[PDB]
Amino acid sequence: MLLAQKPFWQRHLAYPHINLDTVAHSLRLTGPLDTTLLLRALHLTVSEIDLFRARFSAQGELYWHPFSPPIDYQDLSIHLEAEPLAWRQIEQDLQRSSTLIDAPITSHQVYRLSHSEHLIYTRAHHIVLDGYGMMLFEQRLSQHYQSLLSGQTPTAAFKPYQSYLEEEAAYLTSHRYWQDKQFWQGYLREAPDLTLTSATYDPQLSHAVSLSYTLNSQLNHLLLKLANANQIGWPDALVALCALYLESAEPDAPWLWLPFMNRWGSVAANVPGLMVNSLPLLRLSAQQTSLGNYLKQSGQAIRSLYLHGRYRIEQIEQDQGLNAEQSYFMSPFINILPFESPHFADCQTELKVLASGSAEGINFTFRGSPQHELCLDITADLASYPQSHWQSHCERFPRFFEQLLARFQQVEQDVARLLAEPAA
Amino acid sequence: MLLAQKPFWQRHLAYPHINLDTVAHSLRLTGPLDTTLLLRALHLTVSEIDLFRARFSAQGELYWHPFSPPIDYQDLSIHLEAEPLAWRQIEQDLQRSSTLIDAPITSHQVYRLSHSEHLIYTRAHHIVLDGYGMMLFEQRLSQHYQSLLSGQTPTAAFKPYQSYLEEEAAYLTSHRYWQDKQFWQGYLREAPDLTLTSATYDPQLSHAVSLSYTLNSQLNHLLLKLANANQIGWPDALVALCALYLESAEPDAPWLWLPFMNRWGSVAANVPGLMVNSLPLLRLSAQQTSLGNYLKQSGQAIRSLYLHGRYRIEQIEQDQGLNAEQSYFMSPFINILPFESPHFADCQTELKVLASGSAEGINFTFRGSPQHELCLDITADLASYPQSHWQSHCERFPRFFEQLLARFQQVEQDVARLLAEPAA
Amino acid sequence: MLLAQKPFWQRHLAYPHINLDTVAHSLRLTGPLDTTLLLRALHLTVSEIDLFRARFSAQGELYWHPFSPPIDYQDLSIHLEAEPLAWRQIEQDLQRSSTLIDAPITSHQVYRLSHSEHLIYTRAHHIVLDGYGMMLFEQRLSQHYQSLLSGQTPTAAFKPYQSYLEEEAAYLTSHRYWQDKQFWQGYLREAPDLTLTSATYDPQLSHAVSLSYTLNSQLNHLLLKLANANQIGWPDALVALCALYLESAEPDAPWLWLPFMNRWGSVAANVPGLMVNSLPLLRLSAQQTSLGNYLKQSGQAIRSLYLHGRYRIEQIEQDQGLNAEQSYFMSPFINILPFESPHFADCQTELKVLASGSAEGINFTFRGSPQHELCLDITADLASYPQSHWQSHCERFPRFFEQLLARFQQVEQDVARLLAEPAA
Known part of the structure; x- marks a missing residue:
């Protein structure tokens, strides 16, 4: 078992009767899809993922099941309550006991609701799959389907x-x-000390709240420009902007936590699994600096995190003296979700996140892309983060973007001029 | 548009009325050559070079012309003033006002002067072609002509x-x-600060003065014997010897600028275009060192620069805090061009460099090969370099080479011997 | 010549007659070995080792022989005086003159005793091969054999x-x-002063004495266990433990010398040769710290050595201001020999060290593996070490292990508890 998998394994031994770290997505395909080829495609994709065959002994020993995960298919186009029938079974799996010892870690269900409607449900435990792994699984499913449909030889396997x-x-x-x-x-x-996880924090008592704010298109164009001008991608740019924002919004929080995929330059880029690593970024001060210098210097600080990013935070915890019963409070936390849902010829894909771990502290999430629609989700776990502050963020963060777009207007959309003004 | 291209683009926008960065070669072929097949060969070679189809919008966007460049041919074997008619048109092109905007970047003209005389003119702007690229073009031309003449199939295309x-x-x-x-x-x-281009330097006011100096055979042999001995290529050996010559001839200049092809190990080795990178080499001191130790350790240093050579000098300028209106003064500069002219059956080839960049500082260009004929060309641009210094280099550099052969004669032409002696 | 090679060169000049630094193993293969394929394998192996072609001039210049070393094979199956004939030629080589100067630096002899018995002799002067080096040689020989036995093409050459x-x-x-x-x-x-080499010391007058103690399985499993707990390798854990034992066995000896292979993350990993660096580990205090805390911190310091190990000890001496006539007395010295003997299909390998160069002071060598069997080897040079203290160590070092095994059982094999009790 990998260091990165240990904490998930322990959480499970600490709260067995509950599925705390599950990852489930549902894909809804509307269109003249070829049921049979989709099923083959899904069967092919899953065969390529070795970790989906992982199993754990009572002693935490990881060993390998010799068969690939089953694909449970059901043609429901016959019933009038097709959808409700499919969703009862999806919820059933979400509510399963979710044991980890000697059991299958993933589940795959497919439903033909009508000739133009299909529902794909994929579920795994966070211990064998993270977000990036999930999308890799989705893109691969896409790839195999297209190959089968177009009768071409599929590209390389994971x-x-x-x-x-x-x-x-x-x-x-x-x-x-x-x-x-x-x-x-x-x-x-x-640097200032990192915050530890409260000793009285019970993961199961989580109580999540959230709000979504769609960024104005004009901001997206600016976001890109800003990104370009600093030789950084928009995701890294938002992380910088988000840190700038926290300068006023939560000055007493010196850290912003990020997820480094840990796929960069690695064979993991072609191996669905658990590799994501949480790292703390020490936010740069906004005093005595231009916005332009803020973004550039933040980008470097961020980059620096990625370069040393393969070193496990769990390991860092040990290096810093925390004992086994301790962990860092990774909050505030930022997540950028840029990937599109998987495509299938002549179909629309509606992706739905049904499960994705547990919310701790406050989380800022950006899903979408400045090229299209980009939304901001402010989520907090009231059991480990004050509700009022969450309230405040939901009103202040969106305004923050409204301003930036303004300071831009009142400077005749001159990228260089805006980067010219002070960070503050 | 690549970074390497940006500066040529900017120079053009800054001075549209002049051709600062044009590359142009004339190949005069004497022999009973097959005109029709030469034309075909030229037609096939240019069609394999994608970049010659490049064009730029007024915004600096590089888009693609769908057709290969035209090959303008003229049979002039009838006129009494054949050669003069050819050269008059060439000079005209060398005098056309470059226009990188929505226009073809290359020109190809062939002239049949007489059954046994042909003149090929190839012109490109430096933004799509460098030295190495030009030679790939000439060699490819040679390959195709040879394939067509013998009937054989040509080797792989670019x-x-x-x-x-x-x-x-x-x-x-x-x-x-x-x-x-x-x-x-x-x-x-x-290391010591690098020099920045004077802020008053006007590229068009350039005024280049030059002078050649063939190295006697005994030196060329010595160059090779020295290179082999230190297990390094003669170009680096030659670079070292210049480094050493400069130690005494120009001690108040620690850096020596070199061109890194960026071809070896990359697809660029099979793709004509712009990839050469100018990087600064810090001269090693000649004090307390044997000639041999100087050569080897210089080679080790050059190689170190090689390994990081793909990193763009323009990027470095940014990393080192220069602003958009600044740049490094890349002088002195030692450019080595080993390539031989392209060959054609039953023919002699006369290659003539009609245009290449534009002088800046003092330049030591070596053309040839220590096995054949190697001529040293001291070029200087009085608009940015001390005329008196230039003349002084023309005198002492050849003397430096003469003293080298001499000190060699001194110890019975014993390579080990000559190498054990002190550097200076 | 490399710095690490110079002291061997010196020793040779100072005592031209005697062959003081030699490494020579014998490998007895019992089974149905394919003689011919073995000889081919040996041939291929020596040919991959450039350093076995090294030769030294009178002035100590290292030059290269153009040919791979010869392999002398003799089929003694028909002869009655079999083994005696083999060993007699072996002893003759160990008893060679071979004044380093202009002589094959190695020797390779192979003997077929019967169709079932083969004897391989390999000798090299320590100046071109160390222990690891010898191991690499042995492993490559088994790779080649196996490759020829199966129809498989061999892996990469050194x-x-x-x-x-x-x-x-x-x-x-x-x-x-x-x-x-x-x-x-x-x-x-x-830190305390390092002990210099006695000025009245004569390498040729070595008088070695040795005695082996086989660590009982009980301990082996504990060793490994102890290793895991402190997230460290068992060889590193054995050093830490030796440093501990030395806290009350020779408290006046602040330092413990360790051989650092210096292969870690270097081409040297695939190049048999001389790279081992002897370095001083400042033994940590066994007071005010728990056993588990001693091991963890010992490993850290040990890690630091390896991390800075590429710097040559001979270079350190020069840095510490020692003159050419001086060196560090490297005693006590612990050596870990984990590597198994080469393996050949359906055969038995009986490895035997016939020469490993003379060593000063006292040496603690661990041969074998906790995974299987390992024996402590206490060896001393009476001409440079008190025979008394030696016998002292022979009785007291093992006891130290019986105590550890006992203090363990005396805590109900409670690993974390053993690591809780103070140092000694």
Whole structure:
């Protein structure tokens, strides 16, 4: 078992009767799709994912099931209560006991609701799949379907999970491992303390609240320009902007937590699994600096995180002295969700996140793309984050974007002029 | 548009009325050549070079013309004033006002002067073609003509430019990119300031003065014997010897500028275009060192620059805080061009460089090969370099080479011997 | 010549007659070995090792022989005086004159005793091969054999030695070089003086004595266990433990010398040769810390050595201001020998060390593996170490392990508890 999987494994031993870290998506395809080919496509995709065959012993020993995950298919086009019938079974799986010992970690269900309506349900435990893995699974499903439909030879399959283990093993014994430890050690030393997880925090008592604000299109164009002008992508740009925002909105929070996919330059880029790593970014001050210099310098600080990003935060926790019963309070946290839902010839795809872990602290999420629609979701777990502050963020963050777009207007949309003004 | 191209683009917008960065070669062929097949060969070679179909919008957007460039041919074997008619048209092109906007960037003219005389003129703007690229073009022309003459099938065609764009795009995203960034950052920290282009320098007021100096055979042999001995290529050997010559001839200049092809190991080796990168080499001191040790350690240094050579100098200028209106004064500069002229059966080839960049500073260009004829060309632009210094280089550089052969004669032409002696 | 090679060169000049530094193994293969394929395998293996072609001039210049070393094979199956004939020729080589100067630096002899018995002899002077080196050689020989036995094509050949020289030179001119210098400087300044080599010491007058103690399985499993707990390797854990035992067995000995292979993350990993660096570990205090806390911190310090290990100990001596006639007395010395003997299909391998170079002081060597069997080897040079203290160590070191095994059982195999009780 990988260090990154241990915390999930422990949470499970600590609250067995409940599925705290599940990942489930539903795909709704509307269109003249070829049922049979989709089923083959799904069966093919799943075969390529070695980790979906993972199983754990009572002692946490990971071992491998020899068969690929079953694909439960049902033609419901016959019944009038087709949809409700499909959703009862989907909820059934969501409400399953979700044990981990000697059991299948994933589930795959397909429903033909009508000749032009299909419902695909995919579920896994966070211990064998993260967000990026999920989309990889979706794109692959897409790829196999297109190949089957167009009668072409499909492109290459996911590399075996074993190739990733080997790569990870080599990294753990490499000098880079030590340069990384070195780097996080210095980063935190010359910095304000990180917040630990409360001793009285019960993961199951989570109580999530949320609000979504759709960013104005004019802001998206600016977002891009701003990104370009600083030789950074819009996701990294939003992380910078978000940190700038927190300068006023929550000055006492010196840290902004980020998820580094840990797929960059690695075979993991072709191996669905668990690799995401949570890292803390020390927000730069807005005092005595231009917005332009703020974005550029934040981007570098962020980049620096990615370069030493393969070093596990769990490991950092140990390096910093926390004991086994401790963990960092990764809040505030930012997530950028840029990936499109998987495509299928002559169909519309409606993707729905049915499960995705547990909310802790406050979370800022950006789903979509400045090229189309980009929304901001402000989610807080009232059991570990004050409701009023959450209230405040839902009113202040959106305004923050309204201003930026304004300061731009009142400067005749001159990218260089806006980057010219002070960060504050 | 690539970064390497931006500066040529800007120079054009700044001075539209002049051809600052044009490349043009004339190939005069003497022999009973097959005109029709030469034309075909030229037709096929230009069609394989995607970049020659490039064009730019007034906004600097590079788009693609669907047709290969035209090959303008003229049989002039009838006129009494044949050669003069050819050259008058060439000079005219060398005098056309460049226009990178929505216009063809290359020109191809062939002239049949007499049954045994042909003149080929090839012109491109530096923004789509460099030295190495020109030679790939000439060699390819030679290959095709030879294939057609013997009936054989031609060897593989140039890869598409798209492949290079992709490879480049990946490098810009890789870990190497950041490794290269840190490197140039360290290298420039541990060293004397680099010089910046005077702010009053006007590219058009350039005024280049030149002078050749063939190296006697005994030196060329010595160059090779020295290179082999230090297990390095003669070009680097030659670069070292210049580094050494400069130590005494121009001690108040620590840097020496070099061109890095960026061809080896990349698809660029099979894609004509612009890839050469000018990078600064910090001269090693000649004090306390044997000649041999100087050569080897210089080679080790050059190689170090090679490895990080894909990192763009324009990027470095930004990393080092220069602004949009500044740049490095890349002088002195030592440019080595080993390539031989293209060959055609039963013919002699006379290559003539009709246009190349534009003089800046003092330039040491070596053309040839130590096995054949190697001529040193000291060029200077009095508009940006001390005329007196230039003359002084013309005197002492050849003397430097003469003293070298001499000190060699001194110890019975014993390579080990000559190498054990002190550097200076 | 490399710095690590110079002291061997010196020893040879100072005592031309005696062959003081030799590494020589014998491998007895019992089974139905394919003689011919073995001989081919041996042939292929020696040909991949550039360094076995090294030869030294009178002035100590290292030059290269153009041919791979010969392999002398004799079928003694028909002869009656079999084994005696083999060993007699072996002893003759161990008893060669071979004044390093202009002589084959290695020897390879193969003997077929019967169709079931084969004896392989391999000798090299320590100046071109260390322990790891010898191991690599052995493993490559089994790879080749196996490859020829099965119809499989062999894996990659050892990289060329020039590769390593090129890497080392790069390191010497690097900043990493300077950091290592810094680390060693301070690590020594803030610590007790290292013991210099007695001026009245004569290498040729070595008088070795040894005695082996086989660590009982009970302990083996504990060793491994102890290793896991402190997230460290068992060899590193054995050093930590040896340093502990030395806290009350020779309290006046602040330092413990360790051999650092210096193969870690280097082409040297695929280049048999001399790279081992002897370094001083400042033994940590066994007071005011728990066993588990001692191991964890010992491993950290040990890690630091490896991390700065590329800096040469001979270089450190020069840095500490020692003159050419001086060196560090490297005693106590712990050596870990984990590697198994080469394996050949359907055969038995009985490895035997016939020469491993003379060593000063006292040495603690761990041969084998906790996974299977391992024996502690206490060896001493009476001409440089008190025979008394030696016998002292022979009785007291094992006891130290019976105590650890006992203090363990005496805590109901409670691993975390053993690691809770203070140092000693």
